[PDB]
């Protein structure tokens, strides 16, 4: 708190917020997109609460393994750029539940996907972004939780009433560039502080705290030791944290849900000048989604080395006064490094750009949630839509969304042993693989009817929501005290459970679609993996996948070069791997 007290940086913060207010009022006073405002806008998603707090927190807790999620998201991003955007533009659709309405029968599929997308928004984006803003303001200005939260709500209300959302090309590419440059400068400051790179390797393994004895209660040595067998990427599949079969396959199906079916990610890239612009923006975003290993998980262990008392607490009586949480709290690994290892000319710039990249990721999700609600549920129940009532029920809906999202926070800040990445993935894994399985079998197999996909979705929800309710009513617990759950559904792992739920939902929907009636081919022509040119009946911008044959060639060589560089980083960080002695 003392570090940001100085007036010198406050000038940088206020002129940055005045700059974004000026470009918002310029947007209010003044779909043909270029590849660079597509790549930065795809890269800046899940930044601020899944790239700074949770990713660096799990890196300070475990090590280098959580960086592989970044390369899994890279590969699924390129799969989105190749495959799913031509499918979304061939059928002439703008999102996933409208596609399923133009693929399946009546309204129940669309309203169930709307309810599920709203609950996934509340559980994984709005609450996590509000909690990450609360961590930022609590570790910067020393206040409590609720006052920091309502300051964040006030400044994001000013940001969305200014009108920065309408010019989200320039503001997001500027915030992405400034944030990436500042994080590179902070990584160069961080590796200069610990003394190179070998001292970073050796000093991290002996980075225990010093308050390990709480009088009568004394914790085991495995709680505060930094997992001394774990510095390498691919852990043990059975009893290792983030196991390597489960890592690749569970993060593949989770990033296939997130990077292909989310209502704002594809709409962000559907509005573009050409298909080659979309593929070039996806390759640029794939290049930018390669850095967070060297950018945001290596400083996580730097903050374990430098301050091994606020990042690696074990004892709750003093851990509640340092970070505000009863157990572990590794979430503050990255903001403690920003407010301590920066000069005064950039420490304001970093806390300004890591709040601009959060206010944008809140004002996108609030507008998308209001659109989904008042265009897919309230317009289907009332079916009259007096427009003043529509506007006031949208405003009352987003106020209700804030009201529930604030109250969800004390589950988030102590949900999964302190971490935040292990909450986002643990909530996405219980509700995303049914949607991913139903989407995949709706595209590729083509003998699927509406009675099969809906009941597969409902059985996947009845298993995953049961696991979610049984988990959060009990919890993982501390190292010393094991969880009191029925272990056969509680404690396998939440990635193994994601693969099991994906396979179970796929088998259930293919069984129910093979029992009942099929779907006639005569009105499934453009969509569902077919290139015919005959009409259909069911239920300028781009309306093509075409480009020049030279540009298709250079895009294919750039994509195979990006896969070559990604598999080079994979094959480097898996080949060399340090093992410790007895």
């Amino acid at each position, epitope marked *: 708190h003392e570090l940001i007290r100085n007036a010198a940086d406050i000038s940088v913060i206020v002129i940055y917020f005045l700059l974004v207010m000026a470009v918002g009022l310029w947007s209010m006073f003044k779909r043909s997109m270029v590849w660079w405002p597509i790549g930065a806008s795809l890269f800046a998603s899940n930044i601020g609460s899944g790239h700074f707090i949770g990713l660096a927190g799990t890196g300070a807790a475990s090590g280098l393994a959580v960086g592989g999620f970044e390369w899994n998201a890279l590969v699924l991003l390129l799969v989105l750029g190749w495959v799913f955007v031509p499918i979304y533009i061939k059928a002439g659709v703008v999102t996933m539940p409208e596609y399923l309405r133009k693929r399946f029968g009546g309204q129940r599929i669309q309203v169930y996907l709307s309810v599920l997308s709203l609950f996934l928004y509340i559980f994984t984006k709005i609450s996590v972004d509000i909690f990450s803003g609360a961590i930022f303001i609590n570790l910067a200005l020393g206040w409590n939780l609720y006052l920091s939260i309502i300051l964040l709500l006030a400044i994001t209300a000013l940001y969305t009433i200014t009108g920065g959302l309408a010019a989200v090309i320039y503001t997001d590419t500027l915030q992405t560039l400034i944030m990436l440059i500042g994080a590179l400068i902070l990584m160069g400051f961080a590796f200069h502080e610990v003394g190179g790179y*070998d001292a970073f*390797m*050796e000093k991290y*393994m*002996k980075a225990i705290p010093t308050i390990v004895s709480d009088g009568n209660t004394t914790f085991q040595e495995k709680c505060y030791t930094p997992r*001394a067998d774990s510095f390498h990427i691919f852990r043990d599949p059975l009893t290792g944290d983030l196991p390597w079969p489960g890592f690749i396959f569970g993060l593949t199906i989770l990033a296939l849900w997130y990077w292909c079916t989310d209502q704002v990610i594809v709409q962000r890239c559907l509005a573009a000048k050409n298909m080659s612009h979309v593929k070039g923006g996806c390759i640029l975003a794939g290049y930018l989604k390669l850095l967070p290993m060297f950018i945001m998980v290596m400083p996580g262990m730097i903050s374990r080395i430098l301050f091994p008392d606020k990042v690696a607490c074990v004892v709750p009586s003093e851990c509640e006064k340092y970070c505000g949480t009863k157990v572990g709290c590794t979430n503050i690994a990255y903001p403690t490094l920003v407010v301590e290892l920066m000069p005064n000319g950039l420490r304001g710039l970093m806390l300004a750009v890591m709040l601009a990249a959060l206010m944008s990721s809140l004002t996108s999700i609030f507008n998308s949630a209001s659109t989904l609600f008042t265009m897919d549920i309230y317009a289907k129940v009332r079916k009259r839509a007096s427009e003043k009532e529509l506007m006031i029920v949208g405003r009352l809906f987003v106020l209700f969304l804030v009201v529930v999202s604030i109250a969800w926070i004390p589950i988030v800040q102590s949900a999964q042993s302190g971490q935040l990445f292990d909450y986002i993935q643990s909530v996405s894994s219980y509700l995303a693989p049914p949607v991913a399985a139903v989407f995949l079998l709706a595209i590729f197999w083509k003998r699927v009817n509406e009675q099969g996909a809906f009941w597969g979705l409902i059985l996947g929800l009845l298993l995953g929501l049961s696991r979610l309710i049984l988990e959060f009513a009990y919890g993982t617990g501390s190292c010393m005290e094991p969880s009191n759950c029925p272990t056969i559904i509680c404690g396998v792992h939440y990635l193994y459970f994601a693969i099991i739920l994906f396979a179970i939902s796929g088998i259930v929907t293919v069984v129910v679609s093979l029992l009942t009636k099929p779907i006639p081919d005569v009105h499934l022509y453009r969509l569902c993996w077919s290139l015919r040119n005959s009409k259909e009946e069911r239920i300028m911008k781009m309306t093509d996948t075409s480009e020049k044959p030279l540009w298709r060639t250079v895009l294919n060589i750039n994509a195979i070069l990006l896969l070559a560089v990604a598999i080079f980083c994979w094959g*480097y960080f898996a*080949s*060399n*791997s*340090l*093992e*410790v*002695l*007895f």
Partner: nanobody, 117 residues
Framework: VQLQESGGGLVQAGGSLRLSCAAS????????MGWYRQAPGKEREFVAT???????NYADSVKGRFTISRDNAKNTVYLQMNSLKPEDTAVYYC????????????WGQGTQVTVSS
């Protein structure tokens, strides 16, 4: 963090000495603790890079007559050289690697062996 070494000294031709290099202060198990000699007026030339699994790789001049074996769980390399000939009058450093793509992070101080005839 430091490579303590000993064993070097003076002996006549045809003799045999054992060179030791016991690391300390580290937590990891080192990979390629191979010796590197240096003749006066010459560079560092020969490799003896025993791996983590254990696989010697000599220079052809010292091949066969020189042997090397480390205990694979206690991080101490022992170079046992035999049939000393008067071209080996050189200082003999130690040299280690963390990993097979790091290229010799640490280094040794220097152990000089002088053989006479």
């Amino acid at each position: 963090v430091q490579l303590q070494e000993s064993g070097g000294g003076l002996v006549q031709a045809g003799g045999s000495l054992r060179l030791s290099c016991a690391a300390s202060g580290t937590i990891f198990v080192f990979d390629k603790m191979g010796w590197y000699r240096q003749a006066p007026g010459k560079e560092r030339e020969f490799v003896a890079t025993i791996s983590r699994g254990g696989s010697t790789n000599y220079a052809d001049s010292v091949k066969g007559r020189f042997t090397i074996s480390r205990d694979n769980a206690k991080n101490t390399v022992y170079l046992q050289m035999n049939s000393l000939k008067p071209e080996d009058t050189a200082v003999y450093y130690c040299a280690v690697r963390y990993t097979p793509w790091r290229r010799y992070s640490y280094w040794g101080q220097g152990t000089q062996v002088t053989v006479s005839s």
